[PDB]
Ligand binder design. Structure first.
Ligand SMILES: CCOc1ccc(C(C)=O)cc1-c1cc(NC(=O)c2ccco2)cc(-c2c(N)noc2C)c1
Length: 116
């Protein structure tokens, strides 16, 4: 894979991550890792093998852990897929996940087009 400059990835992709943070209350379940003890859901790590959340993605962006932009896009979708997998279709977190995924699709859209 071709490697991008971490500072360049941050400048192109961080605004799309901040667009998710701005969603209130839709982003609230996603701003910190799922704490199954705090939330009363002990089976969470039985079902979600690769947890992901906004804070981890932001950390990976801030410390240059992504070599190329589709790794960022992979983590965002991992975050959303975890939530669609774990939560019931009738629940508020599922709805929030679908709202947030919509905002993301709009934003990531011209950004990846400008990185090619
Ligand atoms: C039992 C349901 O809770 C979840 C269930 C599943 C998931 C995911 C991602 O699969 C997230 C939350 C969740 C929801 C919220 N926020 C809500 O608004 C909410 C919860 C319930 C009613 O409203 C905040 C947090 C959270 C966090 N990430 N860090 O501290 C806290 C507190 C987590």
């Amino acid at each position: 894979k071709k490697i991008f400059k971490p500072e360049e990835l941050r400048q192109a992709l961080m605004p799309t991550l901040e667009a998710l943070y701005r969603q209130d209350p839709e982003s609230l379940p996603f701003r910190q890792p799922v704490d199954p003890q705090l939330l009363g859901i002990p089976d969470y790590f039985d079902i979600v093998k690769n947890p992901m959340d906004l804070s981890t993605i932001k950390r990976k962006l801030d410390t240059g852990q992504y070599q190329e932009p589709w790794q960022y896009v992979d983590d965002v979708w991992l975050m959303f897929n975890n939530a669609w997998l774990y939560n019931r279709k009738t629940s508020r977190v599922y709805k929030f996940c679908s709202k947030l995924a919509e905002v993301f699709e709009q934003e990531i859209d011209p950004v990846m087009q400008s990185l090619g």
